[PDB]
Ligand binder design. Structure first.
Ligand SMILES: Nc1nc2c(ncn2[C@@H]2O[C@H](COP(=O)(O)OP(=O)(O)O)[C@@H](O)[C@H]2O)c(=O)[nH]1
Ligand SMILES: Nc1nc2c(ncn2[C@@H]2O[C@H](COP(=O)(O)OP(N)(=O)O)[C@@H](O)[C@H]2O)c(=O)[nH]1
Ligand SMILES: [Mg+2]
Lengths: 190, 190
């Protein structure tokens, strides 16, 4: 059986876990959201062949800067996430996450993922957003950052409404798909 | 370069073209629908590699039973479409469409595509439907037909709201992805 490793990174609270659960369980963790990350698997049919898709959540706290990279080995693709309603999370993508990923896994592809896009149109949100003359990160703004940082592409979604959620992982797979050629892989290595 | 041929079939008026245009132009032709039976081409990145995705529209009219199949050679995957609000279109999937592409392309994979899912919750349609002793097709029903007829999987969308539209073609690609040695090619032949 063939496998694809996808590590998910990003600032704390951007909705990494919710999007993983929502995707794997088809239901948004409205109840007790496991405030303790995990490791999931999904079986995906590609060309009529079954593939195991490993999804790895991570801890975004600085105190894990030491540990976190321990999961990177073997990753076929990364999901650098930021909330389209959190500028901090967005700026922190170029300053921290991309650099980190590129450092250890330089050949490993990554996608830029905007999360919680349902809160962009939300009134209650943009109301406390102008409380620093800021506005929701735009797709183009994000698309631009993606272009610059050289991400495979930009994708956003809502773990809550599940909008584009499936697509986020479809792209992950497409990007992850390795080359048969003399093991010309992009898999991360110690 | 590397290419994937996707032929789209289905009863007239299920929305094959609108879904093709909506996906390729990112805009639903709300104005007037292009009467010419065209084929489009999209470039898709798979494993960091550029692939050309050919999308071929067809004429579902009984008057082209003879001609229509002329576009089947080389197809990597088919999209058998029916509107989730047109029972006749759904019946014809098993009655006409699958039988036909199966006859011409026995080894070629296909997806079942429910179209116009936005109309499932539309009063007017639901009324007019119920009046003629009918009701919109439900995912379960379709999923069951997909299971029976042995479709790669069932997927629906709205070319109008674009919901699930990208996904329909993501699945098409995944399903189309051919195997290493050409001995196990699913590309339709004459
Ligand atoms: N509400 C709604 N109408 C649609 C949708 N897709 C197509 N249509 C309409 O369905 C009719 C036939 O669509 P068209 O693409 O020409 O059908 P085709 O002949 O199967 O290609 C037209 O009136 C379209 O505007 C959709 O997603 N939602
Ligand atoms: N509206 C909305 N809220 C979300 C979304 N994803 C996560 N959340 C909420 O955001 C908070 C942080 O999410 P969580 O998964 O714990 O984040 P982390 N720290 O990346 O694991 C939670 O309160 C959660 O319910 C989303 O897509 N939309
Ligand atoms: Mg048409």
């Amino acid at each position: 059986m063939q496998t694809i490793k996808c590590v998910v990174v990003g600032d704390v609270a951007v909705g990494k876990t919710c999007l993983l659960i929502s995707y794997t369980t088809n239901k948004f963790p409205s109840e007790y959201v496991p405030t303790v990350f995990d490791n999931y698997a999904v079986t995906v049919m590609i060309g009529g062949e079954p593939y195991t898709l490993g999804l790895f959540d991570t801890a975004g706290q600085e105190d894990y800067d030491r540990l976190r990279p321990l999961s990177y080995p073997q990753t076929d693709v990364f999901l650098v996430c930021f909330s389209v309603v959190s500028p901090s999370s967005f700026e922190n993508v170029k300053e921290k996450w991309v650099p980190e990923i590129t450092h250890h896994c330089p050949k490993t592809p990554f996608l830029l993922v905007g999360t919680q896009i349902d809160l962009r149109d939300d009134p209650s949100t943009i109301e406390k957003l102008a409380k620093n003359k800021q506005k929701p990160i735009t797709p183009e703004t994000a698309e631009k950052l993606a272009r610059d940082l050289k991400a495979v592409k930009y994708v956003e979604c809502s773990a809550l409404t599940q909008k584009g959620l499936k697509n986020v992982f479809d792209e992950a797979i497409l990007a992850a798909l390795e080359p048969p050629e003399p093991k010309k892989s992009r898999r991360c290595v110690l």
